[model samples]
Target: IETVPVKLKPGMDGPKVKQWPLTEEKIKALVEICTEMEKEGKISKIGPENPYNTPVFAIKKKDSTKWRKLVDFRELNKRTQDFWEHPAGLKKKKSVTVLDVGDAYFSVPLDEDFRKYTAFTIPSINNETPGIRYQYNVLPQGWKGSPAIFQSSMTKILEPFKKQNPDIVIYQYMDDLYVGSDLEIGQHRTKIEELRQHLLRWGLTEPPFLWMGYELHPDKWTVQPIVLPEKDSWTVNDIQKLVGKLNWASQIYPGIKVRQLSKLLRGTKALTEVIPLTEEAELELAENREILKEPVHGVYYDPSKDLIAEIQKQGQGQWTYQIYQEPFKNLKTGKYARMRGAHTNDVKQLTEAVQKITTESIVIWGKTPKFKLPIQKETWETWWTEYWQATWIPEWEFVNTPPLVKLWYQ
Candidate 1:
């Protein structure tokens, strides 16, 4: 039972790079989380004289009642020196419940004196105020190396617990964990309660690192209400995002194609300019909210289909892969679950989607494996293997997806 604070030497650049103007919600989130972390002593407000100037940004995640603030450790690592590293799986049949620890990265601290190397400079909401700076006391999410450290750190931490409850059947991918048991739902909850109770070393000390999406009120167990954040104003970009989100949701709940969503963007002068929200737009936003709050259905895993795996590499710590069987409904939705992220990413993302099949099941499933668009230029492979196999494919096919251009008739 030891604290796994990240060890570091000074990063290469201190006062390099600047941040763009952030929105009200994002800026507010940035302040809130930093201060919250400060209150918990996971971070500290420091003077601007740090060796590195890591910038921070906020993003709206799956459903944003609050923004997901992230540090730009990509920029820091790009110019820094290195001490390199280290990174799970699921079960069949047994009912599984997920447990996600909030701010899991913070669980592994940034080694004491080394924390100064991660000082991130922030822009004040008002120009008159001086630049704000805060340093991390724990690992930052976007850092390429953090995953490896956390994976190893967590694996060590859970070693004793695993030995104690060998029957719990657990698989962890950093903080997102899955514990399955043939037991009833209530029993599973009690087992989770036992795991939390037994794990005593690291600090959840200040305010108890609460489990996300669950409420433990003794008499009744309730789930948190997931929501999109309430906003003060609207923008052309925001309207476009609303359209994209509604378009995406249309797959689950039909009829909301965001057909009239474009109306909100009509009067906008520029993408970033805050536009007035009309009554129709307000109603449209309301409809989007309701649709996004789609009906929850039981998780169904299809045995007939192959499990899909995606790889994320931290290299020195090695690339880790995730596998999950896809999902369903009455509507003519897409065939499988697809994971999407920011198009321009600092870390190399998964290659083409590969439907994995085992050697013995090859004859049983009897269907040829399929491959989707190979997005990553480097990690994209020529072949995908089974139990251990890959057949080669043409490289030029994905050299670059040709851009669609309007034909100009001569």
Candidate 2:
């Protein structure tokens, strides 16, 4: 652990807050962890006259039935504006060894002056004794700057190992280190063992990282199509939702179709604009559907056939029917004056009629039509400009400026 000074904004006071509500069991668990960490030289008692203090809370650890203490540093983080490229050659390797270092944040020593800002008070169980206050001596969790600081230190420590093994590509993301090579299992294990020994010296431990099986693989995910409303019309909110779905998929796996959809979204003004889909846009959507192909499940009902059946069933004795002789063709000026035929065996007649000309078409489904007049180039360009401004300006202004704008040129 090394001492690194923290620079704070001048004339700004630190925040002081209380502890979160917790059960006795939770309090006990936090106390135990704090005691263990303090004994490990990770924390120490702070004097009454400290400049800053933050609240602490107990949260359940993910994937396990254990509690972990968390500090709220939102106020401190707001005052601090203090803020890795992967190796390209690693793609050549078929298999790689990955290492995860536990309790990485606590491994670094905190600067003396900055330590007081992380102070918190735990209540005493008995009324006789007052609450004891303490602060972190090492880098604490829940601070925004902790990850970057830890990553920087770990990179420097691992640099020597990468130099020693020129063939193995070493990549570090925070506490996770990945070593890859185009070598057999025996050779890979040998190199991993060499790296493991170096890390162990720095208080890093290794678990039995194993390959389950060669044949076993991750389960497949099928992308089901989003069924639009019957009218094929959408409000601003609807379009935004549509864009979100398409944008997510495109981000995961890039494609021309997804990009086109994204560009179209950029053209819209707002969620409530309620824009009608242009003929060209409709065609593009249909093409996308064709590319994905319809999934094997859907509900389809032909309402016209049902209406015809109901009419025939109700007109049992009151009405007569006229049979078309050799399917006569009457263009216009042709109206049904009167028919002269008695109803006979109503169910059988209707059944025969339905069987002869069965119009079994789907009623509720997607509708996309090809257009005679396509969207003009000028309109598309205008839409793209509006979208670019809305999407780019807010993001850039938040963090950076003009140089970042150039990065999006492609």
Candidate 3:
């Protein structure tokens, strides 16, 4: 199937930037991976001059034996049109199987024109053939538009199959295509295999069994939100990256408060400046991770059912929302039944207090609930508009987010 060639902004081209120095370990890995890419015809050897020369680096994978060539596409990303205008949930009683498309970004072939922006320089090993420029003939990773583009293609590609196999529930996010259905066993399993065969034609592969860093199970997916920050040093950017990672995990642990990460979110220093990882910051993070790793749960959302949305002010300019499909069933085990969850959207920084219209926060199932905070109106109204504008979720969809609610409000 022919894909849309990448479209870059007019006159936005990459200037040929020379390769920066790297450690010997990186050089060895680059030789290994780049050589494989060249042999596989994913990248092409070019001369000294090329239209676009972005920097490339080797990032060690989970284990030292492997490395991936990371093409720095920040400039290219800014230059290109987003294939998707913008951009998870696991629920109970579902049999989940995550399909990880092999070399997902590269699976989408790129025509010659856009390849210019993806070209990069790598010096010859042992001074064998001097430095050479190479560019990807396929969509490369690290491009901002990659997720949107890949998702668009995968969705488009599967349209026919989806139309035919209405029984299977397939969710595609970038390269991670989740194939799941009720545990009816035979037909669903066969349908999954059929989907696999179709995807195999595209040269994709089997599962990582990981989605959004969570492990999939029959009903619930699991995740460890925090890793030990044992490393001695960190740039402000490094801390920020970890913050973003944990923030992703914050979907399940909605109340992380971002308060624990306040010091880590400090903007006083440049992103490039390397700083010592403070003891307090590490301690603060560890404290939250303990609470976060606690099991979270969700039930298959039935949108037609009545949803209870409870909003409460958590003192001074801050508020929280806990939505439910069913009232929490406090069990004998002293834990709330894992059926419902909430979003930790404390939009504190955005607006001031509003007039306390009704201290009694109403719960209306048939009619939509209106928020009347004890503060001013216009400021809160503008805040509402901005908040709504930031998140593109359909108004009614908010009714179903149990474990799937995002922290976009923060």
lDDT of each prediction vs. the true structure? 0.48, 0.47, 0.50
What is the TM-score of each predicted model, taking all chains together? 0.43, 0.44, 0.42
Model 2 Cα lDDT, one tens digit per residue, 280-373:
7676566654543443233232323221111112233322111111111100001111222324543333322322111110001111111111
lDDT of 1 by residue, 86-200 (tens): 0012333255554544356666677675677677766777665776788777766655445556777567768887787666666543234556566666777787776665444
lDDT of model 1 at position 119: 78
Clashing pairs in 1: 5-109, 64-229, 86-317, 110-138, 384-390, 385-389, 385-390, 386-389
lDDT of 1 at 347: 28
- The residue-by-residue lDDT of candidate 3 on 1-410, one tens digit each, is 35556677777556456666555676677777788888878788876566567767665322133455666554565577756440032333256554545365676777677677788877655666766678888767666556566776677669889798666666543334556566565765676677766655665432222111212343122221234355667777777776776666566566554554557666698988887656676676776667656655553434365444433444334444444555431000110112111233333332211111111111111112233233345444334322221101111112223332223222
Off-target runs (Cα >4 Å) in candidate 2 are: 59-67, 81-107, 123-131, 147-152, 164-196, 204-285, 288-410
> In lDDT terms, how accurate is model 2?
0.47
How many angstroms is residue 277 displaced in model 3 relative to the true structure, after the best TM-score fit?
A: 40
Q: Where is the poorest 10-residue window by lDDT in model 2?
A: 389-398
Q: How does candidate 3 fare on TM-score?
A: 0.42
TM-score: the better of candidates 2 and 3: 2
